[PDB]
């Protein structure tokens, strides 16, 4: 499959850079969509289930208040998330259908995933079986292989950013922390429990931090809780840099060996950062029963299929208070988001 993968990644890179250098802009208008319900909200803005008035297609629309983005010093982060989203294309990355802005806000109309957040499912069930966790882990591995080939580091892997689609496959969201870079970078960003030692520490780091994050994810999915936790982030960083890890007794020896290789402090020996790159992971014994191309092709039967009552049903999401979408008669931050 080697040749075919190198070949595939070649075409992917050229299609990416074309869109990356000439990003799409203003591909829709707010009035084309009927607001339905708020799917999630926080410092990150608000995501609403919306319906295209003419086609009837449902979408997940992320709305960002320009003034707030600026207050939060997230101008570059937001412009960057949208640039990346319109440039990439992978089965496990949620698609950006349309994007536009008005006097007060920025809008990213994304694919709507009725299955809900992986976070909710995990906490509901407690923990996934090793085969169930392996299915998801495989998707992330392929996703990172794709992103890293484009010199893109994700930086925010966690159950909260993964959604479960209709066929029970994973869909990655939120690129507000991603970055395109060849080499090292230093920014302190991401989620505490998932930070690699080198992110916490002042020294620079690279794409290897994504692989460490994969380790944390596999651990949480298989254990029901993360490998490093505490009351406060400060205490979490302490355990992470110490890097001492304990595994549940129900963890198989192969799972434990993969994790020892992923949650490796010596970023010089961490799987995914060695000469054989991703293949060390793809060829590890834990992933022995994994059919990589079939996973990529979505032919593998998902171990878990989320319940679904319709394309506009929000039963797998949480409830939020609705808030009117206001659009000023005056343009705010025009110069700052001209590129959006």
């Amino acid at each position: 499959e080697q040749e075919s993968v190198k070949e595939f990644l070649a075409k992917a890179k050229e299609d990416f850079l074309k869109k990356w250098e000439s990003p799409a802009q203003n591909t829709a208008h707010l009035d084309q969509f009927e607001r339905i319900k708020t799917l999630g909200t926080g410092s990150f803005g608000r995501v609403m289930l919306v319906k295209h008035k003419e086609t009837g297609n449902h979408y997940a629309m992320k709305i960002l208040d320009k003034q707030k983005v600026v207050k939060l010093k997230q101008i570059e982060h937001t412009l960057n998330e949208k640039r990346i989203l319109q440039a990439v294309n992978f089965p496990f990355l949620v698609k950006l259908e349309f994007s536009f802005k008005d006097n007060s806000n920025l809008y990213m109309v994304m694919e709507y995933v009725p299955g809900g957040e992986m976070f909710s499912h995990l906490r509901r069930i407690g923990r996934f079986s090793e085969p169930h966790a392996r299915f998801y882990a495989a998707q992330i591995v392929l996703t990172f292989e794709y992103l890293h080939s484009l010199d893109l580091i994700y930086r925010d892997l966690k159950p909260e950013n993964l959604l479960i689609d209709q066929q029970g496959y994973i869909q990655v969201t939120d690129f507000g922390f991603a970055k395109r870079v060849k080499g090292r970078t230093w920014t302190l960003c991401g989620t505490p429990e998932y930070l690699a030692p080198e992110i916490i520490l002042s020294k620079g780091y690279n794409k290897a931090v994504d692989w460490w994050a994969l380790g944390v994810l596999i651990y949480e999915m298989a254990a029901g809780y993360p490998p490093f936790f505490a009351d406060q982030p400060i205490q979490i960083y302490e355990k992470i840099v110490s890097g001492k890890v304990r595994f549940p007794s129900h963890f198989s020896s192969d799972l434990k060996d993969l994790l020892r290789n992923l949650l490796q402090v010596d970023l010089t020996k961490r799987f995914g950062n060695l000469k054989n790159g991703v293949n060390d992971i793809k060829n590890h014994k834990w992933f022995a029963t994994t059919d990589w191309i079939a996973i990529y092709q979505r032919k593998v039967e998902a171990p878990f299929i989320p319940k679904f009552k319709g394309p506009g049903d929000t039963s797998n999401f949480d409830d939020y208070e609705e808030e009117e979408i206001r659009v000023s008669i005056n343009e705010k931050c025009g110069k700052e988001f001209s590129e959006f």
């Binding site: 926080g42 410092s43 990150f44 939060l72 976070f119 906490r123 925010d156 966690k158 909260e160 507000g176 922390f177 302190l188 960003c189 991401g190 989620t191 505490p192 429990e193 029901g224 809780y225 936790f229 505490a230 009351d231 982030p233 304990r246 549940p248």
Partner: peptide, 19 residues
């Protein structure tokens, strides 16, 4: 147990990215 410790940690809910 570790599990008991986790449920009493105050961080079993949705975790925000650091700002």
């Amino acid at each position: 147990t570790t599990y008991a410790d986790f449920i009493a940690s105050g961080r079993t809910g949705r975790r925000n990215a650091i700002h």
